[PDB]
Amino acid sequence: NAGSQPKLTEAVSLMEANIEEPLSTDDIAYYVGVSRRQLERLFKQYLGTVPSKYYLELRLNRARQLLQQTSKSIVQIGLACGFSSGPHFSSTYRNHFNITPREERAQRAQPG
Numbered sequence: 524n525a526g527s528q529p530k531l532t533e534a535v536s537l538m539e540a541n542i543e544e545p546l547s548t549d550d551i552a553y554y555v556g557v558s559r560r561q562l563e564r565l566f567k568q569y570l571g572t573v574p575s576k577y578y579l580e581l582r583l584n585r586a587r588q589l590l591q592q593t594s595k596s597i598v599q600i601g602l603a604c605g606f607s608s609g610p611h612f613s614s615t616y617r618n619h620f621n622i623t624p625r626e627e628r629a630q631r632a633q634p635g
């Protein structure tokens with residue numbers, strides 16, 4: 524279970540501190556003190572994915588937070604979350620959340 528895997532939770536905390544300019548997987552591993560292979564094994568075992576893909580999920584969730592709370596353009600938000608084009612940001616966002624960034628912002632005020 525992830526909370527009982529301190530190395531994995533450490534890596535995730537480090538990733539959370541580096542969203543706009545994300546660390547390479549190798550750099551996460553160096554800073555947490557495991558090999559790259561070991562870091563990959565942790566992510567595969569305790570989260571079910573690879574570190575780079577979890578990092579993308581994290582950056583997409585920060586983007587969702589910005590879509591719900593700012594008037595920053597779609598382009599601005601994509602750049603702030605490490606994306607390098609609008610089409611790349613919006614397409615990956617839509618694949619992940621099954622709505623577009625524009626739809627997420629339109630729906631931010633949903634009162635439940």
Ligand SMILES: [Cl-]
Nearest residue numbers: 540541542543
């Ligand atoms: Cl950041």
